């Protein structure tokens, strides 16, 4: 059944006497592979048949010669590995998956897996199993292989748009007079624009012997406006005055 045609022709002759003889016509060592061309003959007594055949292997050529006589009587591959070298990878590892228990007709199945996909190949020998698996895996991989200050200005513009009328009142009122309550109006802006104000008067005294306060805007940035005075309360009022200056110079457009 699955005998090779050289053995098939040998079987058809050995039942009728006669042993064939193979003679190599021509081998050709070209640029990338050599070709082999055999001639098979058939007796010297009664109808001396003959044929010739060729292939890229000696056994393939002998097989093709015998197959032609039966009909008468009726390369890199590692382009895959170069491509693996191109896309920054370790080399592939095809692995011997399984085999058939019969010794002379075992058809191997060999799988090649890498970090992306998995493929496999079945062959009459394990070498052609690797060729079919590597062709399928090559097919699989070749089918589907300051600005911070501007940001602060932007969301402070948004909180300005969420503030309300006290920004325009702040613009249209001179802050030189202390008759407008700085701390109270900053708290009004806090209640108005969903935030809170913070006042820090640190306990020590300066070289000038004065008091100072830092007002912190409890919003997204860190936020400090400074102020000082001879007393603690005047220092906190001047700090809220500088906070009003901050919101004022932010407001005008």
């Amino acid at each position: 059944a699955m005998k090779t045609p050289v053995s098939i022709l040998q079987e058809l002759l050995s039942r009728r006497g006669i042993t064939p003889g193979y003679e190599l016509v021509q081998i050709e060592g070209a640029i990338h592979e050599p070709t082999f061309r055999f001639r098979v003959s058939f007796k010297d007594k009664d109808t001396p048949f003959t044929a010739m055949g060729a292939g890229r292997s000696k056994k393939e050529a002998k097989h093709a010669a015998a197959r032609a006589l039966i009909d008468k009587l009726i390369n890199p591959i590692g382009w895959l590995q170069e491509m693996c070298m191109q896309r920054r990878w370790p080399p592939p590892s095809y692995e011997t998956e399984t085999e058939v228990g019969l010794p002379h007709e075992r058809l191997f199945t060999i799988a090649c897996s890498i970090l992306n996909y998995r493929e496999m190949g079945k062959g009459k020998s394990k070498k052609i199993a690797k060729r079919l698996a590597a062709h399928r895996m090559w097919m699989r991989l070749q089918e589907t292989p300051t600005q911070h200050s501007n940001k602060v200005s932007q969301f402070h513009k948004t909180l300005k748009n969420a503030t309300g009328k006290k920004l325009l009142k702040l613009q249209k009122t001179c802050l030189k007079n202390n008759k407008i309550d700085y701390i109270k109006l900053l708290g009004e802006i806090a209640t108005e624009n969903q935030f809170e104000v913070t006042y820090v008067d640190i306990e020590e005294k300066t070289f000038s012997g004065q008091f100072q306060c830092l007002v912190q805007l409890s919003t997204l940035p860190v936020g400090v406006c400074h102020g000082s005075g001879p007393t603690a309360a005047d220092a906190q009022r001047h700090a809220a005055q500088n906070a009003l200056e901050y919101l004022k110079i932010m407001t005008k457009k």
């Binding site: 050995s14 021509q26 080399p91 000038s208 400090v224 406006c225 005008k252």
Partner: protein, 1664 residues
Amino acid sequence: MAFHWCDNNLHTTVFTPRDFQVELLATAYERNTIICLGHRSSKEFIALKLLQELSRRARRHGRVSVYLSCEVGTSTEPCSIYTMLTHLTDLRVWQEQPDMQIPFDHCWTDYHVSILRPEGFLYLLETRELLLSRVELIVLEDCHDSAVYQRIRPLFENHIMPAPPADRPRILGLAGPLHSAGCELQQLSAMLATLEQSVLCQIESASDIVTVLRYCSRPHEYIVQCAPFEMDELSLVLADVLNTHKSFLLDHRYDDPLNVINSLLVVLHEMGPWCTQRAAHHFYQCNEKLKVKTPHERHYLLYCLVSTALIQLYSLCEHAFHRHLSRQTIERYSSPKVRRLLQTLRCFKTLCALIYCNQNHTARVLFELLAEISRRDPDLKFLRCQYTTDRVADPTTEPKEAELEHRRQEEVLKRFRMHDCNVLIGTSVLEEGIDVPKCNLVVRWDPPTTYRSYVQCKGRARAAPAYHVILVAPSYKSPTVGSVQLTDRSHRYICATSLASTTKDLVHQMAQYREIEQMLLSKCANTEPPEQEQCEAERFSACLAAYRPKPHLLTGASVDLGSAIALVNKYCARLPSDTFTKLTALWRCTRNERAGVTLFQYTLRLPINSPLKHDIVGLPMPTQTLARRLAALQACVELHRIGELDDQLQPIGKEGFRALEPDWECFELEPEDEQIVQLSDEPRPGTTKRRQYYYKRIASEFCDCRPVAGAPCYLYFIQLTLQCPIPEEQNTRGRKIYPPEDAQQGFGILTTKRIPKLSAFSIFTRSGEVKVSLELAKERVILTSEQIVCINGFLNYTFTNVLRLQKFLMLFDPDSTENCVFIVPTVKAPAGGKHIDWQFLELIQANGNTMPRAVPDEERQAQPFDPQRFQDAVVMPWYRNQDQPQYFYVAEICPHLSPLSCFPGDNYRTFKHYYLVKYGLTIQNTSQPLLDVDHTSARLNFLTPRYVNRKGVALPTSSEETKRAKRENLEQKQILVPELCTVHPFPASLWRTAVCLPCILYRINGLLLADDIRKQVSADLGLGRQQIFEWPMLDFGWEKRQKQLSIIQATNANERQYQQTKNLLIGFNFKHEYEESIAKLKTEIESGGMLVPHDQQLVVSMMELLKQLLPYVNEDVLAKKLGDRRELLLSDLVELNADWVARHEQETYNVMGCGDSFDNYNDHHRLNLDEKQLKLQYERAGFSFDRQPDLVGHPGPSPSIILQALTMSNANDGINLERLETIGDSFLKYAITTYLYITYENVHEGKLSHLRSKQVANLNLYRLGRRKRLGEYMIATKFEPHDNWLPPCYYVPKELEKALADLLDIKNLSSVQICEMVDFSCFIPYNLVSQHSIPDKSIADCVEALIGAYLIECGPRGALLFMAWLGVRVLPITRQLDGGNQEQRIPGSTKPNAENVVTVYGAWPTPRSPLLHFAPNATEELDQLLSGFEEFEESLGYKFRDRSYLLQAMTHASYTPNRLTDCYQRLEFLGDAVLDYLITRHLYEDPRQHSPGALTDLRSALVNNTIFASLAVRHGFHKFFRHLSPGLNDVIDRFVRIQQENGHCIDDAEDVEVPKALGDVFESIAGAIFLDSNMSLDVVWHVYSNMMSPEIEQFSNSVPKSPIRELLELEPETAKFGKPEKLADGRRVRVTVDVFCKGTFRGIGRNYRIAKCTAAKCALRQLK
């Protein structure tokens, strides 16, 4: 490509200056100088070289050096210079210990450099055991600051001043910059003079500062006063806000913001509100990280309040010109200093601008302003700007942002280097270090507050119309008033909306800087001609008919007076150099008076590697520019005369050079080869990609050879003798062995012409190993007409019926022309010997093609079994295979079996059955024995054994099961029935020898083709013998202190430069131990148009010349000499001077150069050095390598070794060419190199490489062997005697194969008449039986392999003569004319060809030693320039007998004191070939029998410039390699520092640089030991085996590999090395390799090669 610009090329008027360091040591060599260099490493280089030169002067009548050093005597750590002096010189140096007290017995006169501290030498000179008249150099380590000055004052004012100047040594004083000594300047001119009065020198300050001062395009100085910066409303509000916050933060309490305050106020007051917001950018980006990065909550409050202050400023500016409302917008808000920078860039409209700053935010905001305005304005489209900062991060902490900073410096300075950006707005890092293009503008932004900042950054503008523009603005005055709130104008804004003092002080500052550089040029000696001298000579440059090579043609070349100097510079800058060599023309000016005018003669000097070894004494002119131009014109005429400058007058180059001897030029060939060469699309000749078909040449002992009747023919016996029985492990069937030497019937050759002697080769049979020979039958055999017919029938029987060798297409032709020898069956005689078996020949005639008779049962019943009819028989059966029979041997006649003994299987009963069932036969005698038979041989290639493969490894045999198991199981035997078999007339023993026949005939033909080659070359060139002793037989061959020390060495080596970069500070002052010039220069600056104001926008007949230029020649003589010619030939100037020199006394010239610059160091011969006055004349056994057998009478090689050379590796044979082919490749390259050194005695070796590479290429060796048709003698195929073999006396039509009683006309008449008488297509050319395809490279391989064969038998002379036969003429010819009868026939001596001459090939002469006698005492200067290399000679064990080879090998191309030889480059070229051959020949002869790959990789590990430099340093080079290169001294310094760490053993990784010049001098010492020894290879190998034999033996037992190959193959498709990228420094480069999914690893080095090597070492020790 992208760069492709002028880069100034090379200088045209000043001779392209040498680098300053060797000029300083030139001046120091003859003057007591004071070298003013800020760099400690430069001072250390000059001191090292100067102690070396004056040490060479010292140890001749006995002197000593001293190095008084203030940083000595505290720690016992050796100093800065003790390292360099003890590991880079051969001297013995003695830095004294802290409180040193004379270790044991310590006589001071046995010390050469003697490092001390200043008070130590006061001690040691008052000790009076180191006398001052013995000291030859006194290097004051510092004498430019007051402390050590007061300490060294007792030395001078006690000992040096009370000493006559005939005893005072050189007083090289290593001062720092006199141009950085910081004492205003009003007393500067005093103190150095005071210094010169007190250390007894005079300053010869010639630095990198001064070399730009003299020999460069002086840029145009434009110190622009900008304007006062007035304030508008917005800037006043901003100043109010930051002053308010500054005065507050003075009082804010925490019981670095002043950095932001003290930076942003200056930005506001010097650039304006726009750059104030774009520096609020930089400082708020600093705060946005440094407010989070702090752990203190109140410091967090402080940094964030400063951040909100910067927010306030940025919002104020953003609400001011985008919101209140753009080149008028930026010009409105910029300060005027920005405006003048804009006008300076607008006017200079091409550019390479180099703006400078001193703070990083300043540079960043200048970048932002130029980016904005360049993307706005029409004028500055061409400004694409890129900035710089300094190194604000540290390699200890935050290495991610520090590395990102380093990559930003790398990526900015790479794209400034070509032309991608023209503008580099840098900071203080750009002054030194970083390399930039030639510049045509440096706009310095601040005033340069230091002189050095002024000069090292003005001295970067070198694109000849270059500019230097300094901006001047009023300095910072704080408008701060106190802790007040916002002002009335500030509140109104937010609700509604002194040049003269600064300019005068910079004028005084720049007048001081001008006086500094005027004092610097005052201190420099080599004064240079002013600009008006160039203008005068330019006017004078037409009265001279220029020198013409082809004066008939007005298109051809011409050398005028400007092109004279430009051509001398172009010639010397095309002379060959390495990376560290500066090759320049030296020049010595002069003056003397000549009957009136004083005239300025020059003397010239070209580099040492130039072939022009003379002093080109130039001709005088009134102005020294004009006589400089004429001296270079005299040089260019002499250059074209001597043949450097060819007939087009541009130096020649490699490509245009042509081989001089006419045999070396030919390179001619059969015209199909040059057709393929001109085609350039087929596989080109000489390669392995082109297959050409040739003819399997049947030997000339086998053509026209058949006997005809009566012709006496010789009878050879094909003797077979078994030398090695089969091992019983391979004996998987247990058969008896059969020796063939006791077999009765064997064979014989029978031939009309004698086969000569051949190598008794061996075959490998089923029965073991047999030795095949041939032996003659003495009685020559006469054949009758009848016996020829029976031998014809027999030979058709033996090679057609028995062995089945005859193909289809071939015929038996009994009367055949070629391949026509007889084979006859020989029988042993009873008494002794053999003869032809005539009875068996008659039997073969009778038993013809007898198809075996199917015996009927009558004879089977009638006659019984016979033992003698089957013992030693061949027992083919007749019931099956009736027409193509199958032949079995007989192992045993087995008696225990029978036809009734049991069948081994189970489908039948015993052996008398199943002959009835399967066949129909009946066994009659059922009481007969049976036949243990094994098949006859059917793979007749018995040339290779089957149980031992090629490397001596023995392949696996057949276990113990498949032996004495199934050996004796009756299933796995062939047992035949003797009445069912016919005994073939050929017995079994005759079948043994008969089946061995085809490979016997093949190997005899192969050894005959090899003997044909031998007799061929012995016919042509006397090389061998023609006929004859037996040839040799044909045989096949078978922790922590390590890193601590490394860190110490690398750190202190870099700490010299770290001490330089911690010394941008102030120098000398005097504690008691001009103004007119300043006012003049102030008037010059305000009046000469240098100072732009604050409003001006920035911007004669030929007879007269003959009278002037020749004032020493009057109205007479000149009138006759000029004649009616329009312009004088140069010979007229030469002739008129020759007349005046003839008339008068001896002239006494005047050496000039203000003294010693470019004199007394280079080219001086006749001088009184005291008063500097010239008196010149204008007019001049255990494996020897060189063992040679007695080649006269030699039989040439053996045909086994020639056969080995002819055998390709496609043969799959035993023998093979490859080891010969590598050894012959290396010997060919060696011998060609040595003859090119002998022959082209002046040619630069990059053209010797061109000529050798033409001789040694694959095209040349293919083409020569194809001229000798070597493709038709080669063995290139696996010998299958059924597929590619022609049996004796058969014939093949040779054309009827492919073009498809009638077949016997093909040889008789024609072929095309026979043709027309009746997987990848189908057509194949080429004939298997009598042709074989060979690649052209395989022909070249057989060429080199045959040189290998002739080499290994008949010596180097024989291999030279074989390449003389083959065509590579590499020997000289001394022709006689029939000088004898060609009976004596010395080898080389060819035919009496055409007219009766011989053409003998001569040996190699001793070449003339390269001691140039262009100076009058070159032997005494050779004795004096090699004082003390005797310890070096002991360090390699061979005394040079002509020491100019040794000096030549040690002389770098920059060692300009050498006037006696060339450089080493030619010896490096020769010694590489010598070393390559010696190593390849050594690894050939190791009995491990290395492969091609093993020998190549073990050579590449043994021969490697890194191994070469390591063995150079280890075995004591580099202390004698005489160079004067600074950078190479640095590289040698660091490399020997590391190699004394290792005890002489072999972010970014940074391996220490391997000095390539040390590998080159490792090679050049081999070349010089070769040449110096009458060209011997066992004087080179003795020395270099004694050096590298530890390395040979260590790398023999393992494999080192290069780090690059070892990484790239240990991760074979994974270790990928990438493209190099250049660093910020511009002389370093970085290579990264990604071992994929395992990491990127990075290395640095100067070049791409050491950078990949370092990266490979990084990943190698990483993955371990």
